[PDB]
Amino acid sequence: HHGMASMSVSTASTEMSVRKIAAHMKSNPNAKVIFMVGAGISTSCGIPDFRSPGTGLYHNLARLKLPYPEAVFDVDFFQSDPLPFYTLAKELYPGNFRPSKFHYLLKLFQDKDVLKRVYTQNIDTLERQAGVKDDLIIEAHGSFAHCHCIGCGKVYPPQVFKSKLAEHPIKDFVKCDVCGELVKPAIVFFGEDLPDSFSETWLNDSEWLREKIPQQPLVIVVGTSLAVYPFASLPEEIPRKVKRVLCNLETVGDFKANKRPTDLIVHQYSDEFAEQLVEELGWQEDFEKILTAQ
Amino acid sequence: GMASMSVSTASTEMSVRKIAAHMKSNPNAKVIFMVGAGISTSCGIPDFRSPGTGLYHNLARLKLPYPEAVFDVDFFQSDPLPFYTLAKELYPGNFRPSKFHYLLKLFQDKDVLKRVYTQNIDTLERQAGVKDDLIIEAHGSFAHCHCIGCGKVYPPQVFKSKLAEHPIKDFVKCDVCGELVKPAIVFFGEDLPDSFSETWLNDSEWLREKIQPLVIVVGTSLAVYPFASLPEEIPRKVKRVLCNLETVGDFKANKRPTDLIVHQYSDEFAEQLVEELGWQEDFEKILTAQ
Amino acid sequence: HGMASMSVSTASTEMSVRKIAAHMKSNPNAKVIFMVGAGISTSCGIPDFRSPGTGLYHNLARLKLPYPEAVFDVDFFQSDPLPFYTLAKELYPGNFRPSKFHYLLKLFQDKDVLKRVYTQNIDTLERQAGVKDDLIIEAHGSFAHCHCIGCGKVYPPQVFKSKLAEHPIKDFVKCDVCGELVKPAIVFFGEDLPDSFSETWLNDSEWLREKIKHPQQPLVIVVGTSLAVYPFASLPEEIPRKVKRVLCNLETVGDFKANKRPTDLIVHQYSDEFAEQLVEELGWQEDFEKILTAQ
Ligand SMILES: Nc1ncnc2c1ncn2[C@@H]1O[C@H](COP(=O)(O)OP(=O)(O)OC[C@H]2O[C@@H](O)[C@H](O)[C@@H]2O)[C@@H](O)[C@H]1O
Ligand SMILES: Nc1ncnc2c1ncn2[C@@H]1O[C@H](COP(=O)(O)OP(=O)(O)OC[C@H]2O[C@@H](O)[C@H](O)[C@@H]2O)[C@@H](O)[C@H]1O
Ligand SMILES: Nc1ncnc2c1ncn2[C@@H]1O[C@H](COP(=O)(O)OP(=O)(O)OC[C@H]2O[C@@H](O)[C@H](O)[C@@H]2O)[C@@H](O)[C@H]1O
Ligand SMILES: [Cl-]
Ligand SMILES: [Cl-]
Ligand SMILES: [Cl-]
Ligand SMILES: [Cl-]
Ligand SMILES: [Zn+2]
Numbered sequence: 056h057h058g059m060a061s062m063s064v065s066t067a068s069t070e071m072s073v074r075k076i077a078a079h080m081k082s083n084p085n086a087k088v089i090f091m092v093g094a095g096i097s098t099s100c101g102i103p104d105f106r107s108p109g110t111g112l113y114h115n116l117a118r119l120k121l122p123y124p125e126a127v128f129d130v131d132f133f134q135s136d137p138l139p140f141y142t143l144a145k146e147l148y149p150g151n152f153r154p155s156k157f158h159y160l161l162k163l164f165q166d167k168d169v170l171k172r173v174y175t176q177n178i179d180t181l182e183r184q185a186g187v188k189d190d191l192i193i194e195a196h197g198s199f200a201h202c203h204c205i206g207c208g209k210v211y212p213p214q215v216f217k218s219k220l221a222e223h224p225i226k227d228f229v230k231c232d233v234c235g236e237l238v239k240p241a242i243v244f245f246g247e248d249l250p251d252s253f254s255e256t257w258l259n260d261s262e263w264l265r266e267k268i269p270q271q272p273l274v275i276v277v278g279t280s281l282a283v284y285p286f287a288s289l290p291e292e293i294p295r296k297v298k299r300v301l302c303n304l305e306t307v308g309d310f311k312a313n314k315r316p317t318d319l320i321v322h323q324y325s326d327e328f329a330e331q332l333v334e335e336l337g338w339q340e341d342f343e344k345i346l347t348a349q
Numbered sequence: 350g351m352a353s354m355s356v357s358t359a360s361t362e363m364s365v366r367k368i369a370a371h372m373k374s375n376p377n378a379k380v381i382f383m384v385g386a387g388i389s390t391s392c393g394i395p396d397f398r399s400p401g402t403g404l405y406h407n408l409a410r411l412k413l414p415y416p417e418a419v420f421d422v423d424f425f426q427s428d429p430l431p432f433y434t435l436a437k438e439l440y441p442g443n444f445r446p447s448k449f450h451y452l453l454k455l456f457q458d459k460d461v462l463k464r465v466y467t468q469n470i471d472t473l474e475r476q477a478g479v480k481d482d483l484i485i486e487a488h489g490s491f492a493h494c495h496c497i498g499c500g501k502v503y504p505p506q507v508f509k510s511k512l513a514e515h516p517i518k519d520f521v522k523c524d525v526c527g528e529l530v531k532p533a534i535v536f537f538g539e540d541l542p543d544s545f546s547e548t549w550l551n552d553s554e555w556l557r558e559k560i561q562p563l564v565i566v567v568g569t570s571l572a573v574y575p576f577a578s579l580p581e582e583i584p585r586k587v588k589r590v591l592c593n594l595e596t597v598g599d600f601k602a603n604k605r606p607t608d609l610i611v612h613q614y615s616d617e618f619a620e621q622l623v624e625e626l627g628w629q630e631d632f633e634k635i636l637t638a639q
Numbered sequence: 640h641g642m643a644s645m646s647v648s649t650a651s652t653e654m655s656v657r658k659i660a661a662h663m664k665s666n667p668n669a670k671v672i673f674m675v676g677a678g679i680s681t682s683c684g685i686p687d688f689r690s691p692g693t694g695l696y697h698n699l700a701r702l703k704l705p706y707p708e709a710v711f712d713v714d715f716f717q718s719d720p721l722p723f724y725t726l727a728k729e730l731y732p733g734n735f736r737p738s739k740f741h742y743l744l745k746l747f748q749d750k751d752v753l754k755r756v757y758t759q760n761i762d763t764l765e766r767q768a769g770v771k772d773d774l775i776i777e778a779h780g781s782f783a784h785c786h787c788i789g790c791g792k793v794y795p796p797q798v799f800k801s802k803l804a805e806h807p808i809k810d811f812v813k814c815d816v817c818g819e820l821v822k823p824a825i826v827f828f829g830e831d832l833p834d835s836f837s838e839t840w841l842n843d844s845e846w847l848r849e850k851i852k853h854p855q856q857p858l859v860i861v862v863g864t865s866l867a868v869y870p871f872a873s874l875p876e877e878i879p880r881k882v883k884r885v886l887c888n889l890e891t892v893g894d895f896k897a898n899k900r901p902t903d904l905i906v907h908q909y910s911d912e913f914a915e916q917l918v919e920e921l922g923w924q925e926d927f928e929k930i931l932t933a934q
């Protein structure tokens with residue numbers, strides 16, 4: 056048997072967890088899956104996460120001589136001193152890296168029509184570079200598609216700011232030609248509001264989920280410490296009747312605070328988790344193809 | 350009163366003192382225990398999840414695909430040997446009850462035991478003298494066997510004798526549906542015994558009806574459901590006790606003001622609780638008798 | 640910096656102390672409530688109660704008690720007061736000087752920015768630092784006077800204190816109107832806290848509720864306490880969600896470890912260091928050093 060009241064353990068090995076997830080999907084064909092990801096799914100691509108000990112970005116910014124680590128991405132600090140961010144802005148642009156196996160899994164799930172959405176906090180855009188349709192990607196923390204004035208919010212093309220970085224001697228910084236305030240790429244900083252698409256789309260997918268509880272859906276959170284708001288408030292807003300999966304090196308956020316009987320916590324690396332899920336779903340072939348094509 | 354200076358994080362000595370006090374104030378009140386592997390560690394049976402020593406961390410000679418494969422119904426169905434191989438050591442018999450098990454017997458004698466919900470299959474509470482009507486084996490036992498297919502029940506001996514056979518030839522099958530037959534102990538994926546959900550359903554009301562009760566949880570990491578849901582389902586108006594080496598489950602998440610948490614080994618806990626209750630005599634006699 | 644903007648729950652210390660000072664700057668004239676425990680007097684040379692090895696409860700072996708907290712339990716006291724008497728001698732205030740954190744409360748007072756200080760200490764150190772009695776709530780009593788554990792009659796201190804000098808302390812002080820034992824008004828487990836505690840909090844809670852038009856936004860700061868004792872430990876949880884909480888302690892505890900609110904500002908610093916750092920971020924280094932020197 057495998058009823059909702061059958062013996063089970065929340066934290067399980069990758070092998071068992073993937074069997075549970077695979078079983079659910081086979082039992083709920085047509086159902087979709089909502090993913091919520093963070094810097095974790097990009098470490099293997101060569102991009103260190105933010106808060107992991109020793110290797111985290113917030114542990115390798117001594118060069119910037121900042122008052123505190125997170126200052127590089129805080130508007131308050133940006134207004135009073137943009138040199139540091141400019142100095143780091145370079146490496147932040149997409150391009151230098153290739154998607155990971157986990158990023159491609161989202162693509163696979165799309166090709167199999169089981170991806171409902173991907174709320175990401177990353178700005179490396181690897182989820183799109185992997186094949187996922189914009190319609191399905193919710194870049195919760197903005198991106199470099201454009202820039203904006205931190206004063207009135209005027210929107211500008213990338214090129215201008217991207218230019219100022221080139222020139223070594225960082226002269227006066229890009230100002231807003233209409234209010235005179237500082238202009239920067241549209242990646243959310245501490246202090247700023249997230250884009251509209253984020254809270255609006257979530258508002259839609261939340262009713263979608265409530266509608267389903269039909270072929271039951273799943274929500275899978277991976278590679279994030281759920282330490283940043285308002286993004287970290289999503290997992291707890293998932294209806295209790297909707298199964299939640301957490302594939303992370305460590306149990307965090309709502310999974311740690313208010314673990315539910317039906318929760319699935321998997322302490323695994325996103326790529327290993329991705330590999331094992333594909334096999335069990337029986338989608339090795341299609342996945343292999345998607346991987347070789349890139 | 351109730352809104353006076355009180356702890357929520359006291360020392361072991363004080364906590365034991367308060368538990369005993371509670372019982373003395375409510376002489377007719379009974380207790381409900383909720384136990385796990387932790388109470389049979391001293392008997393020589395290591396628990397399941399403790400770092401390094403835990404059973405799941407020592408299944409190497411069984412060459413499993415993953416730790417919980419042995420007690421997973423899906424793996425068993427497609428490959429029963431590892432369980433057959435491990436089932437030999439799991440059969441009750443080779444051990445004797447711990448001082449804590451006898452504390453259960455002691456409470457029974459004193460008409461203070463309402464129920465004992467256990468997740469152990471070692472049957473040590475039974476071997477300690479606790480009446481069957483007061484014991485609830487939430488995770489089953491080796492008392493009988495059953496078919497993983499149609500649920501039909503059979504006696505123990507056929508499966509137990511097959512274990513004696515060295516190269517386990519053909520595995521026991523159900524003579525009606527042909528599916529595999531195994532001891533009636535709960536595996537991952539399997540539903541629990543009716544007595545569990547049904548007795549709790551009942552005992553729950555008994556509690557809400559008596560609001561003076563006490564529910565003591567000991568020796569379990571509360572990682573396995575639906576058993577793990579038991580603690581939080583205790584009425585807020587009921588005093589909960591947790592005797593475990595580490596704060597776990599609903600005691601760690603939604604801690605309650607009146608919650609007593611004792612970080613102690615169950616045997617010492619019992620040895621000490623017996624002291625504060627002033628029952629040193631009968632207890633020592635029971636330890637001798639059995 | 641809207642109510643739904645991007646923020647970190649696990650901010651570093653620098654950012655945390657930064658956010659606090661900023662909140663006060665963008666909310667001048669708003670007051671702050673302090674909730675404190677043994678932690679803030681530790682640097683003064685007064686051990687707290689539960690710190691591994693050094694806490695008081697780990698050092699009463701000589702008193703041969705059934706349990707540590709027994710010296711401060713009415714049930715045990717009512718049956719055997721000798722242990723407390725034996726200890727009581729060294730509990731009386733007056734042998735220590737306030738800590739920098741303590742003077743930090745005074746500073747906050749001078750700036751007319753201190754609403755109240757709920758304290759579980761009985762060292763009277765917030766008072767010795769200059770905090771007005773009306774702004775101080777001693778949730779766990781004091782040695783100001785004594786009382787009968789039976790009828791509750793109040794008595795002057797001296798009668799109980801002199802009784803402590805007598806080499807072989809015998810015939811313990813008793814209520815001359817009911818016969819029960821008398822002791823200094825410091826709260827023991829089993830006893831009801833002083834009336835003003837629950838009542839002042841009843842008002843301060845309404846004050847908080849009425850600050851959330853647009854009144855300057857308050858702030859509740861808890862520091863130096865493990866939140867192991869009720870009803871005090873219920874205060875930080877009874878704080879309205881729309882009011883920021885700050886926890887300055889060596890470790891996260893109470894409602895901060897349990898139901899941590901996104902907005903909570905957790906800081907693992909020694910209370911004295913927290914004071915110095917907060918004073919700097921506030922630009923009050925001058926008014927502080929003068930208060931410190933003038934002591
Ligand atoms: N290969 C991996 N597989 C799975 N999890 C991983 C892996 N590598 C690291 N992790 C886990 O992923 C998490 C990474 O956490 P963070 O650094 O905090 O990243 P993220 O949560 O997305 O950070 C949120 C946000 O904070 C801002 O600083 C920034 O703006 C960003 O979007 C950690 O909990 C870590 O253990
Ligand atoms: N002497 C002791 N006294 C008190 N607590 C103890 C003692 N020894 C160990 N413990 C604690 O008891 C708990 C035992 O945890 P588990 O291994 O997880 O055991 P238990 O919860 O009962 O496991 C539940 C179930 O999981 C299945 O695998 C199995 O089927 C079983 O019934 C741990 O948190 C451990 O620290
Ligand atoms: N310099 C310091 N700065 C910050 N925190 C400190 C410092 N020194 C100790 N601490 C922390 O302060 C807390 C002290 O906790 P307690 O001993 O429990 O003290 P307190 O909470 O006030 O105890 C409450 C009450 O319990 C009774 O026993 C007694 O009556 C008392 O008022 C601990 O969490 C400890 O790590
Ligand atoms: Cl759909
Ligand atoms: Cl819900
Ligand atoms: Cl209830
Ligand atoms: Cl509220
Ligand atoms: Zn502008």
Ligand SMILES: [Zn+2]
Nearest residue numbers: 496499523526
């Ligand atoms: Zn059958």
Ligand SMILES: [Zn+2]
Nearest residue numbers: 787790814817
């Ligand atoms: Zn009296």
